[PDB]
From Swiss-Prot, chain A:
The modification Phosphoserine is found at A164, S242. Residues 271-310 are annotated as: UBA-like. Potential therapeutic target for treatment of somatic tumors, such as brain and breast cancers, down-regulation of MELK inhibiting tumorigenesis. This is Maternal embryonic leucine zipper kinase. Induction: Up-regulated in many cancers cells. Up-regulated upon treatment with radiation or 5-fluorouracil (5-FU) in colorectal cancer cells, suggesting that it might be associated with increased resistance of colorectal cells against radiation and 5-FU. Down-regulated upon siomycin A, a thiazole antibiotic, treatment, leading to inhibit tumor growth in vivo. Changing C275A: Abolishes dependence to reducing agents. The active site is at D131. The chain holds residues 2 to 333 of 651 of the full protein. Monomer. Interacts with ZNF622 and PPP1R8. It comes from Homo sapiens. The KA1 domain mediates binding to phospholipids and targeting to membranes. It is found in: Cell membrane. The gene is MELK. Serine/threonine-protein kinase involved in various processes such as cell cycle regulation, self-renewal of stem cells, apoptosis and splicing regulation. Has a broad substrate specificity; phosphorylates BCL2L14, CDC25B, MAP3K5/ASK1 and ZNF622. Acts as an activator of apoptosis by phosphorylating and activating MAP3K5/ASK1. Acts as a regulator of cell cycle, notably by mediating phosphorylation of CDC25B, promoting localization of CDC25B to the centrosome and the spindle poles during mitosis. Plays a key role in cell proliferation and carcinogenesis. Changing C88A: Abolishes dependence to reducing agents. Expressed in placenta, kidney, thymus, testis, ovary and intestine.
Amino acid sequence: KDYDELLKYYELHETIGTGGFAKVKLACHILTGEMVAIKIMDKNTLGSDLPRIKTEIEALKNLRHQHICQLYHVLETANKIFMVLEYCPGGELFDYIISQDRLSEEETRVVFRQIVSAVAYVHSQGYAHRDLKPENLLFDEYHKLKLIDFGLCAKPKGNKDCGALAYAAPELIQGGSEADVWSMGILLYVLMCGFLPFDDDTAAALVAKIMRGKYDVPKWLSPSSILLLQQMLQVDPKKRISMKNLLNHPWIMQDYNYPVEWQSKNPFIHLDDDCVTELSVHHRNNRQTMEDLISLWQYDHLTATYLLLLAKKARGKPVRLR
Amino acid sequence: MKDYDELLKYYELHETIGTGGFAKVKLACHILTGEMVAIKIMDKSDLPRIKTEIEALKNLRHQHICQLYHVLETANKIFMVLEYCPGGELFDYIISQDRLSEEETRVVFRQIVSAVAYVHSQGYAHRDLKPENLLFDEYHKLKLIDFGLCAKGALAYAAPELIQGKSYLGSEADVWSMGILLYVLMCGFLPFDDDTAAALVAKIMRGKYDVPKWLSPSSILLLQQMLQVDPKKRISMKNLLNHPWIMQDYNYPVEWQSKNPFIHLDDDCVTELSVHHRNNRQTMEDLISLWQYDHLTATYLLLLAKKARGKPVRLR
Ligand SMILES: COc1cc(-c2cn[nH]c2)ccc1C(=O)Nc1ccc2c(c1)CC[NH2+]CC2
Ligand SMILES: COc1cc(-c2cn[nH]c2)ccc1C(=O)Nc1ccc2c(c1)CC[NH2+]CC2
């Protein structure tokens, strides 16, 4: 009874889940033929941490970006919440870092310009992620990074509602968007060094290192790398580099000579007309109210079919259902 | 990273297979033996539950229980090095096909029965038997997992006396759950199911269920012996092991006794660990016999499996 609605729309394959509450079940969307990943939560096993699932869904319903792992479809049965998500077979950025030694400056940049694109867009929409680390970034079948787990979340100019400690800003530990900038700075350091700037045996010694904020600057780090690191690793969050200045930073533009393009290429308001026409021939009605219907963004089957059609059109394969 | 330094002396890390807050599962290679392993990584979020499981798995050793090799505790993590189970959940198996045949469900059920009868012999009751908690190893052999709710779950699997406050448990509640499991294997869905949780409870108490046309009268008889609302009326484990349904095609009852020993030690393995350590031998055996669930416990038990798969009793 929990799978009857899900199985009208999706053919279920393997289990890259079998975690706690949330198993990932690789699956195929029947109409389009595109590969999806299905996050499965237990609506009466999840404890007092169902608010995290709801904070994530409501952030993912409002965020749309080339470097954010897309939500296609939400399904709620008796004891189960289902999230139909974008396909990421390439592993975590974490798995990437721990397989190789340390990355070169130009290799970290290629990566880091993608983290910056995503996190800058999050902040434009009034959100702050609050748990940026290399586990929470995944690689798609085209080697591009996707940001995941908005389980902790913002609206810092919104209504009243921590993460990994080695990534946590000083002001976070003692109680904005500037906390995320600190965490991108920790991320930048590990990519180039192969080790954290602050690490210890006990948690109480880790906190003391974050507050004092003194760190090692390895011999192989360039002076451009060092300068950007100290702008991002400011203990005072008012002294930390702004996103407007990060986007076009001299280290950030080496070998690219254009700034980070953060603005979304995945639209809410514009409707692709190849997709509207193919959905119209399938559902059998007029494109006028077809557009009106998609524009509700209910994150049902129609939202899943529209956005997956748009993903198939992006691949190169044709705009076709069955 | 300081949290991975101890682990990474012993294990080469692979695939990141399964997020979920505190509990993440990474695939790993044990460097000395070359044997594949699964690593459960806890973000040190109910840590009495992690500690009940480790404590139960340190004392349980069985061919149809997913083996613990090694426990590692760093600052912010707990690592459990567990048996390799690439074959998926029994759950995934059931939902891919429609329903299983009686003889296909017998092959599968006799393993569930072998494992659960051994759990109960050691003074334990699992309390969360369901098809998500039974995994297939690389030989298509079932391994029972998650002893986090065990005593010394899912409502559709919960016994009537469990729901309304016991007075008291424990082993007969497991028998009810094996009965729910038996039904789903043969039918392709539950004897008690509903849209709301409040309607599910009411169905479990009255205990009346549909008996599909394709279920044999042997299947029906065993089902009603296991699905007794009164736990005193429910079939005993002594009678389950040699039940006529349990034996129909097999010339013999369920062998529940462990083939994985704590006390008796393999000499071929012992003499290979001795050449590595540059120990005498009486010391070597005395040391394994501590069962500390460190690297020496991981290396001994993985050497025992390498010995069993036909490859040589040799370290790398
Ligand atoms: C384990 O995750 C995946 C594996 C494969 C895959 C593996 N092999 N081939 C494909 C493909 C995709 C995923 C995936 O997208 N998972 C995912 C998406 C969002 C979130 C999570 C996971 C973590 C839980 N918290 C919410 C955020
Ligand atoms: C989540 O996976 C496991 C959990 C436990 C466990 C949990 N609790 N106690 C033991 C024990 C073993 C595993 C495991 O080994 N799974 C696994 C192995 C290989 C592969 C996969 C999974 C993904 C599917 N594709 C093939 C690759």
